[PDB]
Structures are given as structure tokens and as C-alpha cells.
């Protein structure tokens, strides 16, 4: 990818860049999944051994406070602002808010809301004053790359994201192991109840949670499962990674072309009855200038 920016890249020291990041040592892990109920068109498989070079990855998704600092320093205008609208979950749109009649095929719970963007996540009249340490949302893949580059970082590849999210466990279902709520404790912010009609908020949150909510995984990362989808660097495909080759097994970058970029981790809207995509092997995609109330990102860096 060759992005274009209207701000200069500031100088930063290695110690500044590494703050809030964990160092993942070079090594191998088993990427992918073989859950029999996986949508075969997501390409969760095959399970494969991948070798990665050492990298740094953020413990937390990028927060509102951090994104605000980026925008203050650069004047950056997000894709949602240029388009003038972004996607908000229906239950979060305040009655009377102007809404577009647009329908996302097969997903009528999404509402295109003029004026919804990172600083007004539910549209005009909403704010992030009470959400400084929540993940920034309504950020597109382009916005994420812009932030990451300004910060001296980059987006993780899907394999880097998944190695870090797995937190040192071999082929577990979730970042922490194989039970969704071990010892009856909620470990991530997803949906409980009847999707899309009623979220019971059993896990504490019916929207985003702070980036440091819940216990971390074994590598110190927080909310890799649930909370917000997280953009990764790779172009999406369902089958590029089915090939056995150095390109797909050593520091894999994904296909060289595509139309949508990979997103990982699931969000506060995920539920087993619909999209069971908070499993660490799960994956989906979105087009790179798209944005939504349940999608953000975390950064990676070369040491």
C-alpha cells in the first residue's frame, strides 16, 4: 500500500514508540481454525504453522484520547467526515436523529447516520466526553493507517494480530482458553441476549467498554476478543493462505491485491446465534474507506 498524507511524520524515539506495546518474540504458532460451524466462506482454515519475525503490538486498542491527540497535531479529517455519515447500531441512534434510508443488505440493524464520526459516535448530539479511554470508532482502514504512521507504527498483519491475540496458547478457541465464561466470569465484551433485539449487558456493557476492560491475555493484550473489530494490514481473501509456500507461512502479508481489508477480534455486537466471530481464529473484512460504531484498531511496530 502507498498512502498519501497531508501531515509530516514526526520524529519519535524507540522508547516513545514502545510505550504501551508488548514485545512478541520471533517464533512459530498455529494460525487458523477448524471449528466445524465456521462459515466455510470466511477461510478460517486451514490450521497452519506460521513463523513471524519479532514485533511490538499495542496492549490496548487506540483510544479516543489518543486519536484526539493525533487529530489535534495533524488536522486529519477522517473518511466518515469526508463522506458525512457512518454506520451506527440501530439501538444507539437517539429518536429524532436524522438518518438516511440506506439499508445494508441482510443487516437492517445498521443505520447510516449523517454526522456520526469518531467524536460523535451516535450522530449529532453525541460526544465522547465520558469515553476518553474507550476505543476510537468510526475510523476507516485509511484513518487507522494514517494514525499508525503518525505514531511511528503500522497495522499488524493478520498473522501478527492472531499470534498476539492467542497469547501463548496453542489452538485455543478464545484468547484465554476454550470456555467463553470460565468460572462464570465474563472475559470480553460481546452481546448477551437476543440479537439484534435486546442486549442484556450481562458483561457490563451494551456499547464499547474502556480499552483496559477485563483481564488481559497471556501476552498482556486487552480486548482482542470483543469490544471493537480491529483493522489489520492484509487484503482479504478466503483462500490465499491455503497455499503452502514461504509467502503464506513466513511473515505472511496476505494477497497482493484485493477489495476489502481484514478485520479481527469481533465486537460488542457479536453473538453465537448470529456471528460467532469473537473466536480468535475468526475473521472478516470491510472496504478500506468504510467506518462503523463497532470498528477500531490497534497498532504494531517493528522493533
Amino acid at each position: 500500500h502507498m498512502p498519501s498524507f497531508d501531515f509530516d511524520i514526526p520524529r519519535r524515539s524507540p522508547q516513545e514508540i514502545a510505550k504501551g506495546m508488548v514485545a512478541i518474540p520471533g517464533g512459530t504458532f498455529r494460525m487458523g481454525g477448524e471449528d466445524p460451524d465456521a462459515f466455510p466462506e470466511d477461510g478460517e482454515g486451514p490450521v497452519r504453522t506460521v513463523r513471524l519475525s519479532p514485533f511490538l503490538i499495542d496492549r490496548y486498542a487506540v483510544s479516543n484520547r489518543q486519536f484526539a491527540a493525533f487529530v489535534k497535531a495533524t488536522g486529519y479529517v477522517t473518511d466518515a467526515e469526508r463522506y458525512g455519515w457512518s454506520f451506527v447500531f440501530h439501538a444507539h441512534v437517539a429518536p429524532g436523529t436524522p438518518v438516511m434510508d440506506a439499508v445494508v443488505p441482510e443487516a437492517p440493524w445498521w443505520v447510516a447516520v449523517p454526522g456520526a464520526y469518531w467524536k460523535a459516535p451516535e450522530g449529532p448530539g453525541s460526544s465522547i466526553t465520558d469515553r476518553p479511554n474507550h476505543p476510537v470508532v468510526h475510523v476507516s482502514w485509511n484513518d487507522a493507517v494514517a494514525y499508525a504512521t503518525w505514531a511511528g507504527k503500522r497495522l499488524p498483519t493478520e498473522a501478527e494480530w492472531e499470534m498476539a491475540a492467542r497469547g501463548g496458547l496453542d489452538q485455543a478457541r478464545y484468547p484465554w482458553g476454550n470456555e467463553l465464561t470460565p468460572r462464570g466470569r465474563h472475559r470480553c465484551n460481546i452481546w448477551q441476549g437476543t440479537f439484534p433485539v435486546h442486549d442484556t449487558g450481562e458483561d457490563g456493557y451494551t456499547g464499547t467498554a474502556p480499552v483496559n476492560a477485563f483481564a488481559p491475555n497471556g501476552y498482556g493484550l486487552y480486548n482482542v476478543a470483543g469490544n471493537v473489530w480491529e483493522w489489520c494490514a492484509d487484503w482479504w481473501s478466503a483462500d490465499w493462505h491455503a497455499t503452502e509456500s514461504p509467502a503464506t507461512r513466513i511473515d505472511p502479508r496476505g494477497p497482493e491485491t484485493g477489495t476489502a481489508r481484514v478485520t479481527k477480534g469481533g465486537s460488542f455486537l457479536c453473538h453465537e446465534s448470529y456471528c460467532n466471530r469473537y473466536r480468535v481464529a475468526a475473521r472478516t473484512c470491510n472496504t478500506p474507506d468504510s467506518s462503523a460504531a463497532h470498528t477500531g484498531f490497534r497498532c504494531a511496530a517493528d522493533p
Binding site: 466462506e41 463522506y83 473489530w229 448470529y274
Partner: peptide, 14 residues
């Protein structure tokens, strides 16, 4: 009925 949708795209509404 079809693959569940988690990522709503700007193109999808056109």
C-alpha cells in the same frame, strides 16, 4: 440464510 455480516461497507448501500 447467507453468511452473517459483521462489516458494513459504504459500497453496500448503493
Amino acid at each position: 440464510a447467507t453468511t452473517p455480516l459483521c462489516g458494513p461497507s459504504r459500497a453496500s448501500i448503493l
